[PDB]
């Protein structure tokens, strides 16, 4: 993985040694070259994962997340140009540096073969992600949103650190390949019950789990556009990736310990979907949408069926592209009217015909119109949970109804209707914004032709 | 609120329209249109405001029981089958300032005429504020009606949007 | 109840303005000022040749429009589909499955020539 780690490090010398006015062109151009070379991780075999060295390896679950991660860095650079134009050059270079380190920590986290190395990097993403929110947010609530984000994660991460170390002292190794052969069944004792909670609650808070989600509406709202894209695209998927890995050493205790987290999730889909129907903030509405879609991944991982693992992997890739696209569309309006209120600007389809088309495509994928990968993953999770208990179809179907309502409610509220009369500064869409949306939707729709590359190891 | 003549006049038009909805045929509507006029003619004038108010409430109660469940509505009116149908083609005027010069050159005459309108707007702005801050009570205005330009060559205050609004069939 | 003199005058002040505005929303005979768009030989050839009604040729001109359509939209696609079906699809097992033809009593088979006995003699009926 050094063929990706070293080039990512070199983005920092490039940014600081480049001319004053070519920093956005150099970093964007070369971060796109790194993304192109990440297609070499698709060399996957039907029996063995791709093992590089004692430290790093990549398999069918990490590869799609690695490709998504390196693809987002160039996109986040584009979306940040507008609101950093009047910023001091020295500080505008530190902003680009925090993103580079975040990518460096993310690719090493998705390939680490040793869980403690995964934990250290898993926990290193908090530092750059906090500074982005607290330093380059606009509102006064960024300071409090920084603390909520910081302490919700650590309150579950520190117990995970004890549990991981306890496993090494007993199994003797945390190398994931070793754990596939030396794994032993988990007996039913009160000590193992809390071992299960320590291993999972770190990943539940980050997904997040309903009831522990109060940090998401604050971090995804007060963060700048670049922070919101990475937060909702890859940093929620660290929770899913963690559970897909650490559930190997929790069976069969996961058969009964999963019940309380399936009811908070199945019911949490309805509660959070319903919240979106009455939100007055367009960025907040997109945030609460992440909770509903991330509640299906939790259910899929906890029932442990081959169909559910394929759906969860496809649900995570699909939601990362859709969720990021929605945040970008919301921010393009904010750059003109400079307010997040959803009812402030109406009938935007009259002024910006093409940007309204991006709104339509962004809405359809959110509600899983077939044969998009949004529907492929959401279908598999609904097929697997039915075998778990046929009554679950009642809850899955209801949420699909409520998803359509709020997905089409924001489209109607802002794009259709009659325009606001005193909003007279809606300038046409720049080529940057249109290019920014097209790089979100074109690759998403292209994966429909060959979806097998984003279905995961159990394909 | 709405005086007393206005309510009876408003109440009279609805009765004709709702009655017109039952009649359908144009011979019958005239047969009962006059009767309804006669029914009001019975209680015309008559003073005694306390008695007139009492009758109107009974008239309103009589009307509601008899209103048509599905009244006729004109297509281009609230509740019709064409209300707001053409608001999706009504682009505001300020959007023309953002045209690319390569597409302004396709209408050199129209934009030349726009320059004069904009030029007039800036020149006349100062007086319209002057005219409005002098012909108004001290404690702010108390009516939505605006006064006209008390001079020659001066445009009425607050005329830009009332004048340059989109056409009713813009395409 | 009618308009007060101040209001009726204001409505007239605006009325003159609006009619002037609607008069300005008109296009001069030259507009739109289209750019130097070039015409292909085919486009200019038909403009010169189509000047006269000449009902005898309107069938010919219609045939060209339809004939151009048929070759590009009905003959090229069927060529591509047939090549796709005959040499790629039908080279794999069960890609194209066909219902076996119906065989009635007293029939001959092309593959081998088998003949099936007609039937047992019927109890003739009427009506």
């Amino acid at each position: 993985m050094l063929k990706y780690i070293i080039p990512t490090i070199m983005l920092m010398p490039l940014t600081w040694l480049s001319k004053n006015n070519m920093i956005w062109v150099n970093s964007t151009a070369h971060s796109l070259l790194i993304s192109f070379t990440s297609l070499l991780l698709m060399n996957q075999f039907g029996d063995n994962s791709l093992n590089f060295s004692l430290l790093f390896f990549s398999d069918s679950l990490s590869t799609p997340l690695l490709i998504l991660t390196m693809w987002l860095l160039p996109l986040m650079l584009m979306a940040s140009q507008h609101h950093l134009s009047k910023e001091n050059l020295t500080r505008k270079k530190l902003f680009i540096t925090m993103l580079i380190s975040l990518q460096l920590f993310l690719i090493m986290t998705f390939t680490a073969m040793e869980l403690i190395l995964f934990y250290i990097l898993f926990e290193a993403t908090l530092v750059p992600t906090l500074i982005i929110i607290t330093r380059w947010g606009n509102q006064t609530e960024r300071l409090n949103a920084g603390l909520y984000f910081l302490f919700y994660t650590l309150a579950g991460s520190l117990p995970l650190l004890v549990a991981l170390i306890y496993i090494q002292n007993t199994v003797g190794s945390l190398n994931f390949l070793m754990l596939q052969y030396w794994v032993q069944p988990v007996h039913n004792s009160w000590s193992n019950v809390f071992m299960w909670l320590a291993c999972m609650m770190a990943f539940m808070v980050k997904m997040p789990l309903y009831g522990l989600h109060l940090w998401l509406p604050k971090a995804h709202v007060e963060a700048p556009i670049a922070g919101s894209m990475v937060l909702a695209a890859v940093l929620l998927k660290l929770g899913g990736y963690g559970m897909l890995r650490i559930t190997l050493i929790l069976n069969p205790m996961t058969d009964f310990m999963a019940y309380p987290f399936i009811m908070l999730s199945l019911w949490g889909m309805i509660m959070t979907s319903s919240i979106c129907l009455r939100q007055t903030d367009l960025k907040s509405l997109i945030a609460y949408s992440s909770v509903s879609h991330m509640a299906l991944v939790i259910v899929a991982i906890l029932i442990q069926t081959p169909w559910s693992y394929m759906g969860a992997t496809a649900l995570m890739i699909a939601h990362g592209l859709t969720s990021s696209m929605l945040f970008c569309l919301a921010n393009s309006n904010y750059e003109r009217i400079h307010s997040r209120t959803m009812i402030l600007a109406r009938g935007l389809q009259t002024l910006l015909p093409l940007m309204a088309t991006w709104w339509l495509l962004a809405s359809l994928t959110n509600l899983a119109l077939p044969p998009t990968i949004n529907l492929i993953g959401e279908l598999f999770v609904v097929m697997s949970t039915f075998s778990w208990s046929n009554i679950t179809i009642i809850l899955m179907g209801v949420n699909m109804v409520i998803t359509a309502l709020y997905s089409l409610y924001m489209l109607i509220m802002t794009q259709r209707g009659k325009y606001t009369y005193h909003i007279n500064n809606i300038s046409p869409s720049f080529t940057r914004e249109n290019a920014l949306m097209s790089l979100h939707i074109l690759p998403l729709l292209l994966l429909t032709l060959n979806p097998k590359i984003i279905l995961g190891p159990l394909y | 609120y709405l005086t007393h003549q206005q309510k009876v006049l408003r109440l009279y038009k609805r009765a004709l329209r709702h009655l017109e909805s039952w009649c359908i045929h144009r011979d019958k509507y005239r047969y009962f249109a006059c009767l309804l006029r006669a029914r009001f003619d019975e209680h015309k004038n008559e003073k005694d405001m306390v008695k007139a108010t009492q009758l109107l409430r009974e008239a309103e109660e009589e009307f509601w029981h008899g209103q048509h469940p599905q009244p006729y509505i004109f297509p281009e009116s609230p509740g019709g089958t064409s209300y707001e149908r053409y608001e999706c083609y009504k682009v505001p005027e300020w959007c023309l300032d953002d045209w690319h010069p390569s597409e302004k050159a396709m209408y050199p005459d129209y934009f030349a005429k726009r320059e004069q309108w904009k030029k007039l707007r800036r020149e006349s702005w100062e007086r319209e504020v002057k005219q409005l801050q002098e012909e108004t009570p001290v404690g702010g205005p108390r009516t939505e009606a605006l006064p006209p330009a008390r001079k020659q060559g001066d445009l009425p205050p607050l005329w830009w949007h009332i004048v340059t609004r989109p056409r009713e069939r813009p395409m | 109840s009618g308009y007060t003199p101040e209001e009726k005058l204001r409505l007239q002040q605006l009325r003159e303005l609006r009619r002037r505005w609607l008069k300005d929303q008109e296009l001069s005979p030259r507009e739109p000022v289209l750019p130097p768009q070039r015409v292909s030989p085919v486009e200019r050839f038909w403009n010169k040749f189509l000047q006269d009604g000449a009902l005898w040729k309107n069938v010919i001109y219609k045939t060209y429009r339809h004939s151009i359509f048929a070759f590009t939209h009905v003959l090229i696609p069927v060529w591509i589909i047939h090549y796709y079906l005959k040499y790629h699809v039908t080279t794999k097992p069960y890609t194209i499955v066909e219902k076996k033809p119906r065989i009635f009593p007293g029939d001959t088979i092309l593959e081998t020539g088998e003949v099936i006995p007609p039937m047992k003699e019927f109890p003739d009926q009427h009506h």
Partner: peptide, 12 residues
């Protein structure tokens, strides 16, 4: 009698 139809900029 053609009239000028106001439209948002279709160039960008």
């Amino acid at each position: 009698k053609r009239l000028f139809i106001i439209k948002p900029s279709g160039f960008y």
